[PDB]
Amino acid sequence: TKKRRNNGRAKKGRGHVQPIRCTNCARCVPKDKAIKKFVIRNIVEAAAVRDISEASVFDAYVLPKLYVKLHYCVSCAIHSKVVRNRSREARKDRTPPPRFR
Amino acid sequence: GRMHAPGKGLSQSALPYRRSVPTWLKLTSDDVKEQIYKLAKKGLTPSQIGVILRDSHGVAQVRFVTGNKILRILKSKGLAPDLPEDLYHLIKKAVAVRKHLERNRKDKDAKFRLILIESRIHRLARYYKTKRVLPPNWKYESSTASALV
Amino acid sequence: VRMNVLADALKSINNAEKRGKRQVLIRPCSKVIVRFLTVMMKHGYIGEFEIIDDHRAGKIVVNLTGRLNKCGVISPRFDVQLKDLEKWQNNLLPSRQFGFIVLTTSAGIMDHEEARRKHTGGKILGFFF
Amino acid sequence: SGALDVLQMKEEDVLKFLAAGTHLGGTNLDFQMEQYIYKRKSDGIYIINLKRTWEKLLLAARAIVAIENPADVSVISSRNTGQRAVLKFAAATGATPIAGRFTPGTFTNQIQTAFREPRLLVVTDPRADHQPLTEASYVNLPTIALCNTDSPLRYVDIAIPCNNKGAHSVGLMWWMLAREVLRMRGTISREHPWEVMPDLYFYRDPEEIEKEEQAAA
Amino acid sequence: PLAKDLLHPSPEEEKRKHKKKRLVQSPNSYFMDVKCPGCYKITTVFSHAQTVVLCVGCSTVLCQPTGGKARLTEGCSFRRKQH
Amino acid sequence: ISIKLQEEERERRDNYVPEVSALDQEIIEVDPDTKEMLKLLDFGSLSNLQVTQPTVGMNFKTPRG
Amino acid sequence: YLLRLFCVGFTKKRNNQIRKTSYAQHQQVRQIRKKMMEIMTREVQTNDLKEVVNKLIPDSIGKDIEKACQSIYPLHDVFVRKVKMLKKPKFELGKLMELHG
RNA sequence: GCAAGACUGCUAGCCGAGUAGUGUUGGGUCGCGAAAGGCCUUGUGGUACUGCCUGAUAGGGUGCUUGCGAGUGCCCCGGGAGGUCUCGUA
RNA sequence: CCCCCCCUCCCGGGAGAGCCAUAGUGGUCUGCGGAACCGGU
């Protein structure tokens, strides 16, 4: 039984792409098949941001962020509840969930 | 589709239905004939001759101002070469590819393109032999690379 | 490449009739096509069909009345006899009250009934019903 | 519709068309509405030809008055914009309205209380209201549509090019259709128009009902 | 369309289509003539030159080879000829 | 369910009409494309119609991603 | 003094643009790189270290870069990302005193 | 040669003058651009404002705001009065 | 004196390359006839 419209990745005219490595795993999943994440994280999220700011010598100093990205294998991503399964009638929904915060 | 390329193309000339001499042009046959004579003794191939005539002298085509094409005129004079121009260019391209592959050893796709152009040379050679413009003892090899350049 | 223009023409007019277009286009043209379309219009499955002429390749515009069901081509070019065409029309035609078999004889492109009444036969072009 | 002399458009109908905004279309373009769009103007808006609109209005009005039973034609509305128009049109002409949640058990289910099979169906828009099209497919029932240049056309006998995003345009088109069908039936004579009010079919948003209630006595 | 008439449509319909999809077969390119502003002799040139051409008298180059139609030298008067 | 009385704000509202029809505006805002549309149907020009400038700015078709 | 100046550049998305891709061809990038190398090597080989540093404390090289490269494809973000030194001349004291005044 | 019409850049009285200087995309009739000096009727009515900044009252960067988003506010000189503008506070 | 100040409101004087316009103002387009045709220098 064929499952999807595509083959499950972003290979449609190439045949082979470069392999990448997972973060919590080490599987050599291809780049067009894996799951990426462009996460933005501050140095202090909500824990002691006022304690950091009031201890700062420089007036009007803003904390920087950490723009790092991670690569997940499919089993590693489904174990960490990153992606979730759904039904067949809504499986053709490429649109991401909405962003608010 | 093409006979070696994977893709299909559509790009060629398209003569109009109107088979007539252009009324705005005032040219006879003798002046354009000696223009063919001069541009042929200058040392150019007939495709470039048709290009330079329809570029400079404003002629639509020679077939609409005469009753024959370029190579028939050149063989009527006798200045047409014994080797056809497309076969000459294909042999020159094959000689250049083999000369490049002499010094570049590990080059697989260039060798494949050499095989393809040798197949083209073979197909045109069988066609030109069976239409009685070349003698049957003619045969293309690598050692003829300096013979028919 | 294209090596049977009549099969392509009949398949194109069959597809365009099944969709229901009124005026169709055929990119090649030949003697066999124009005599086949005249015997079409004489027996009454089409209307006023046109043709454009140029010095390269003519095209044919055919008017339709919807009085056709399916119009196929025998490929390759088979030959029949007078004691043989009944075998073809029994296993090919949908009935004997309608459906015609066209064939090329010595007198030209013509259908099987006047070939039967004139007692001659030859190679077979196609069929329509 | 265009074969005779008196059936052509009048002088104030063009003014009502240009006032109500019955000439501008959406953003895209369909492949069945190609013969009503003449030329694409700026801001990605296509223009319908108003002569075509008036002509198809005459043809649809003729098809409506062709039957001799006034209570056998049905009008359908789904969205909250055009609601009073079809109701007062059925009050004037004699039609049967269904406004708001067209139940699917009307033309097919023959045991229900709301079982009425009509002869002609008039839909406000096929895209916004497609349920009576599917049920009209299952019985001998033609449809009349007020379609826009972005509305898909399917199971439609007579198509009216319209701008169905403003309530004034839909109400004025219903007003002219009612005017034409009563002139063709023989109630209002052709030599004198009955044009007393086009705002009988105009819908206004729920601000203006309170505003006009406070303004009036 | 159902009864789409392919006998004689509007000329915009043959304009928007391809040069070979057109039911009457005719190309789109044309012949033209153009001069030099400081000269008397005027010569003709095709719309797609594909070689660099200079006007007669060996004074100033005229056209430039492009992928499409040949662009002309700045400050030159021309008109399309037809027959 | 229907209500017998809720102080006059019922289906009697679909009876009245404003005294101004809101259609006889003295100035008609018409683009020149619509002017060349209507110059060949039944009219050629109107005194109550003002020909406006074609509001052609930059573009249209705003994106959503 | 021998240096190794690095540069980086990102293209500018127009406010009128609707297409989200906004890439550039390889020859455009090649000619931009050639112009960037020529402009960057022109401003250093003519002057000493102090003058090119005083030109490098504001954005003057970068201002020249988005002055000269917007004619081929509009780009907005160019910083001199890293300057690496390789070799120094013979050690002396007058230069060290004259950089301090 | 006749008939008058629609559009058109600069100057603030004119010559000086589109003149030095001024630009990298490439040229063009090529933008912006004073003068010194000299000469004449002796030099425009109604109509808005101006966050430094590269190129103007334009294009292209880019703020302060109740901490959060926003309506108002932000050229040189002078006179009086006041010293906590507002809409909801994840 | 709430002030070294600074800010806001009310009222005036100066440059501008906005609109309707003035004096010196440069070109494009809108019709009519070159008595009427065929070649050489």
Next chain:
RNA sequence: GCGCAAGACGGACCAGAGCGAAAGCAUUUGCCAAGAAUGUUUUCAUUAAUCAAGAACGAAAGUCGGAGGUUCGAAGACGAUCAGAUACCGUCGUAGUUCCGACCAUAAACGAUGCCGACCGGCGAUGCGGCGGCGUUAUUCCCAUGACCCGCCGGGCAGCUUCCGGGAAACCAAAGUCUUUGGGUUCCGGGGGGAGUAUGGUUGCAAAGCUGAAACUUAAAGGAAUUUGGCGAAGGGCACCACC
């Protein structure tokens, strides 16, 4: 934290994007050679399509000879897990991994769908080349130039939708134009095991690659989808025969 030295690799930029016949291909620069598409009122004029013989290329792993081999890491060595692990896990670790040659021609080398050519609907996008048309950007006026926008043309990866139509259904704009059965052409299969097995030939230093049985047993082996299952599957709600 500062220098030296070796080897490997070119992230983020990188996308349902490009190129190539496929296997595959990402630091800049310099040289050589080839090619699709676009445009053409240029040239030869049937040179055409598919292909038994035969031929080229071909991921990793494998074998033969070398300098040199960072990191990772078959077989193996040492501890914990475990009723029992010579498995999962950790630390070392040889051959290998990279380069120059010499070879076998095997993958889910799969789009599990042969090539060419004709036809049958739409929508909105991206990539190349050409084309027409408002308005902005490279000292303020023009020109084509690079970019922005609106439409058109041809080829390619495509996406959405469609009682066109097809299919056992999953699904397909081809897997369609098929009992209303014939466009041209190459390879290839008849219930399931035995068995890609033994023999024979063939190539190879080497592993194996190609070719390719018989006896006997067997009435099922298989493909699609539905109904409550049953999940150390996910997500909601309830119970003191559950908890705080």
